[PDB]
């Protein structure tokens, strides 16, 4: 009976895989052969931040494209101002250990979590002397790897128990669970419309989840090793994915294919973070090799290189205005780049 | 207006004041990762320092420690172990008696030693349940040569100091298991990290300072590793 289900599953997979050829009538390389490349890009440092004691793991821009927060493993969650290099708040945590951080679109709240399995939400505009924990999102069995705000109330979280979850902060209970992943889910990116999000896990596969329904709309795969980072193309019809196999892969949602693999023979270390530019031409991926390579997302050629940090670059971000890129790293220095 | 820019500069004074005092306490404290099997007795050692993560703090000779027991997550430990690379020293506890799961513990130690991110951090090994191994050998039902054929033709090393009223038969076995741990420690030989094996039991009213003395050696050795004094 177990063999019956295994055999029955194979023809369902076989017909799905066979259909993907029919879709693959050409490659992106032939259609993008004509276009001239971006060529040489010269990104310089602007505003090397200081203040953090231990390695920076995560960061996030705000909607204003001015304030950014980042969490480090020392247990400080401090919000800078990029232009003035100044610390507006320095929020202590209970858990030195924090793998994620997100800044609310309203900017009233801010998210973080790690080994406590709590996406702790903090009020920035507390009338009192110091900021206070609004609501502890307890219930995940495993470490929180990424949590990101949908709205002031709705927040999506990925844990180390292979489950994504939407939470409601007012109610204080997990509303929607996302089951399907085999391995630990590492990253999220919300869609521009905030109706869908993609999430990569330690199984070399990404899954497109519907927020309202709570079911996997579509399953993406083709990566060789544990996936680490994931980000939508700003259109929201496609996304790139960094993995330990030291390549980035663009996946179209509509086409259900893997168009391009961003690999250079020399690079043999995993990708930790990925982000797109506002144009969606400069795919800048942060590597474990203590540098950040700016890939041309169209031509699959390294336009430039941002060899800033001493230790591994953990987190990336691009501003909503698309002025600059920030790169938290294990040397405890957020360098803002432009 | 530019007047408000002075306001944030005054706020930064309090922010900087708090961070600078927070740096003092941060650098003073020693982070330690407590790793081990379910049956290893991680929880037993935490009872000895009378002075879902479980953090414990103990003062020994007025230096603050923080030892992190991680027993909440799933068995998959390839992406949450990365976060303990800044840690001073991984207190790796192992059950000597559980011979079947001893090889699996050895394989776990090999992965920790040869990990990219944990390459720089030394592992304070606690060979726990030494007393329980003592009565197990006298039973003589379970035999190491069944699981480890090299034990059959293995004599005790010269650098052995058995406790009073210990059989030589158990002493060879006792120092074989550590030798198997220390086999991995020497294979890479880049001098970046160093296993500190110790033989411990439940009745041991110690190890508060055994970790202190070993962590003292790494802090001393890490200074000398800079000068090229070794």
């Amino acid at each position, epitope marked *: 009976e177990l063999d019956q289900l295994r055999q029955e599953a194979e023809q369902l997979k076989n017909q799905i895989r066979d259909a993907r050829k029919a879709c693959a009538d050409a490659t992106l390389s032939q259609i993008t052969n004509n276009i001239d490349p971006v060529g040489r890009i010269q990104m310089r440092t602007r505003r090397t931040l200081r203040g953090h004691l231990a390695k920076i793991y995560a960061m996030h821009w705000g909607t204003d494209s001015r304030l950014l927060v980042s969490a480090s493993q020392d247990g400080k969650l401090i919000i800078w101002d990029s232009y003035t290099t100044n610390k507006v708040h320095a929020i202590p945590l209970r858990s030195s250990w924090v793998m994620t951080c997100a800044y609310a679109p309203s900017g009233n709240y801010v998210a973080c979590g790690g080994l406590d399995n709590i996406c702790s939400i903090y009020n920035l505009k507390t009338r009192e002397g110091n900021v206070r924990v609004s609501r502890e999102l307890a219930g995940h069995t495993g470490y929180l790897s990424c949590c990101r705000f949908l709205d002031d109330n709705q927040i999506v979280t990925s844990s180390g128990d292979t489950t994504c979850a939407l939470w409601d902060i007012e109610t204080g209970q997990q509303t929607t669970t996302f089951t399907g992943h085999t391995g630990d889910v590492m990253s999220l990116s919300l869609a521009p419309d905030t109706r869908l999000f993609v999430s990569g896990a330690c199984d070399a596969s990404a899954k497109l989840w519907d927020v309202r329904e709570g079911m996997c709309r579509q399953t993406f795969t083709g990566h060789e090793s544990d996936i680490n980072a994931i980000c939508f193309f700003p259109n929201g019809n496609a996304f790139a994915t960094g993995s330990d196999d*030291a390549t980035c892969r663009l996946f179209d949602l509509r086409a259900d294919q893997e168009l391009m693999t961003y690999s250079h023979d020399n690079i043999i270390c995993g990708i930790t973070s990925v982000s797109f530019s506002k144009s969606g031409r400069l795919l800048l991926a942060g590597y474990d090799d203590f540098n950040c390579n700016v890939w041309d997302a169209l031509k699959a050629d390294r336009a430039g290189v941002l060899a800033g940090h001493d230790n591994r670059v953990s987190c990336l971000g691009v501003t909503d205005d698309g002025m600059a890129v920030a790169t938290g790293s294990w040397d405890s220095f957020l360098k803002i780049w432009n | 207006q530019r007047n408000e820019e002075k306001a944030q500069r005054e706020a930064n004074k309090k922010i900087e004041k708090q961070l600078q005092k927070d740096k003092q306490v941060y650098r003073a404290t020693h982070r330690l990762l407590l790793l081990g099997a379910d049956n290893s007795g991680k929880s037993t050692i935490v009872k000895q320092m009378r002075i879902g993560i479980f953090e414990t703090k103990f003062q020994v000779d007025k230096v603050n420690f923080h030892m992190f027991d991680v027993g909440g997550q799933r068995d998959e430990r390839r992406k949450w172990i990365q976060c303990f690379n800044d840690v001073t020293a991984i207190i790796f506890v192992v059950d000597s008696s559980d011979y079947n799961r001893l090889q699996e513990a050895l394989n776990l130690f090999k992965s920790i*030693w040869n990990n990219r991110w944990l390459r720089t951090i030394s592992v304070i090994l606690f060979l726990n349940k030494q007393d329980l191994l003592a009565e197990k050998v006298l039973a003589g039902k379970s035999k190491i040569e069944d699981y480890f054929p090299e034990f059959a033709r293995y004599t005790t090393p010269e650098d052995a100091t058995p406790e009073p009223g210990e059989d030589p038969r158990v002493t060879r076995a006792k120092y074989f298991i550590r030798d198997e741990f220390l086999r991995i420690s020497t294979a890479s030989g880049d001098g970046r990290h160093y296993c500190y094996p110790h033989f411990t039991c439940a009745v041991d009213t110690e190890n508060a300072r055994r970790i202190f003395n070993d962590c003292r050696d790494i802090i001393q050795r890490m200074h000398l590793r800079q000068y090229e004094l070794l």
Partner: nanobody
Amino acid sequence: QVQLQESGGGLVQPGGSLRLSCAASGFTFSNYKMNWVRQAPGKGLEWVSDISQSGASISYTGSVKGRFTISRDNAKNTLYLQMNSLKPEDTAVYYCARCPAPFTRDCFDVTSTTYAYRGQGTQVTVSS
């Protein structure tokens, strides 16, 4: 798509032989370290053996040391295991496993319950 589909294995008298295979597909075989893992009846996953990317640092659990022999053909993209002497304690399902990271000397979680890069497994059994 990463997939390890085994072949061979089955019923055999004690002291017999069995050539297991682990035809790997949807990734480059050549760059990854592989491993064998067996699951005994009413026991956790257990480690069998290893291969260090070229066949250089191969190791065994000690219980099966000096009996089994691993090889790989990078051209054919296949993993092998040899059986010569088989005890009752050796009746178990044998999963072929791959190391998570591509250019590493550490393998984590390969004996985990729900490891991603493990095959369907072959039930190797010894009985009258």
